[PDB]
């Protein structure tokens, strides 16, 4: 790293800095006075103070990026969000008043809940015992659960089954299925859970 270890990570929250001083705890006050004496890294070119900034979508965009082409990756993301919004508006317009209440038209809400539905609660770790590898059910950390949901979604959309279907069309369709607890990505989560339940007796092989 070109930054020395002293450099601290920039905090980019408008509301944090505007917080009234009176509400600050004694520890919080110390943290603020200390920061004034500390070197800070230049803010990266990705995250900003914009009210429209979504960290999860930014991470998903980077996972889609190929060869540093963030412009193309970002184009695919915004096309997907627009495609989802247009599909829900069509479904909303063709629905009855009672049905219209239950139709979600916010693409960010759909994107967040579709990925949450794909997150696996339990994982499998290969453990070598007596020269034989065993798939052992293990608890997954929160970061790994979220990462796996995104990787499965992107891997599914990149699968060759989809013939001459552009990514925004494929991704929007898959996100809407997962939002409704359907589709192959949800099936991949269920398979992992079923495999871990079958191997529940091997859980003792784990030593942590």
Partner RNA sequence: AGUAAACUGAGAGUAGAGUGCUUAGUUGAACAGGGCCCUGAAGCGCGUACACACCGCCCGUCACCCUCCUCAAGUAUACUUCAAAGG
Structure tokens at 147: 């990462």
The residue from 21, 66, 97, 201 that contacts RNA (CB under 7 A) is 66
Alpha-carbon distance 186 to 66, whole Å? 25
Query: SS3 of 39, please?
Result: coil
Closest CB to RNA among 52 and 208?
208
Report the relative pairing of strands 122-129 and 132-139 from DSSP bridges. Answer: antiparallel
Q: Is 47 in the site for RNA (CB under 7 A)?
A: no
Q: Is 59 in the site for RNA (CB under 7 A)?
A: yes
Alpha-carbon distance 3 to 98, whole Å? 58
Structure tokens at 13: 């929250």
String marking each residue 100-139 x if it binds RNA according to CB under 7 A: ---------------------------xxx----------
Closest CA to 114 of 126, 122, 106: 106
Q: Is 144 in the site for RNA (CB under 7 A)?
A: yes
The residue from 12, 54, 56, 65 that contacts RNA (CB under 7 A) is 65
Residues of the shown chain interacting with RNA in the complex, contacts defined by CB under 7 A: 1-3, 44-46, 59, 62-63, 65-71, 127-129, 141, 143-144, 147, 207-208
């Amino acid at each position: 790293s070109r930054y020395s270890p002293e450099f601290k990570d920039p905090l980019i929250d408008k509301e944090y800095y505007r917080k009234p001083v009176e509400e600050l705890t004694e520890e919080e006050k110390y943290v603020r006075e200390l920061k004034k004496t500390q070197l800070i890294k230049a803010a990266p070119a990705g995250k900003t103070s914009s009210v429209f900034e979504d960290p999860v979508i930014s991470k998903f965009t980077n996972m889609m990026m190929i060869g540093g082409n963030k412009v193309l990756a970002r184009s695919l993301m915004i096309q997907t969000l627009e495609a989802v919004k247009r599909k829900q508006f069509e479904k909303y317009h063709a629905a009855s008043a009672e049905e219209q209440a239950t139709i979600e038209r916010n693409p960010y809400t759909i994107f967040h809940q579709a990925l949450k539905n794909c997150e696996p609660m339990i994982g499998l770790v290969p453990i070598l015992k007596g020269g034989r590898f065993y798939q052992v059910p293990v608890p997954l950390p929160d970061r790994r659960r979220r990462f796996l949901a995104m990787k499965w979604m992107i891997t599914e959309c990149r699968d060759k089954k989809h013939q001459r279907t552009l990514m925004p069309e494929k991704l929007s369709h898959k996100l809407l299925e997962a939002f409704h607890n359907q589709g192959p990505v949800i099936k991949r989560k269920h398979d992992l859970h079923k495999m871990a339940e079958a191997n529940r007796a091997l859980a003792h092989y784990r030593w942590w």
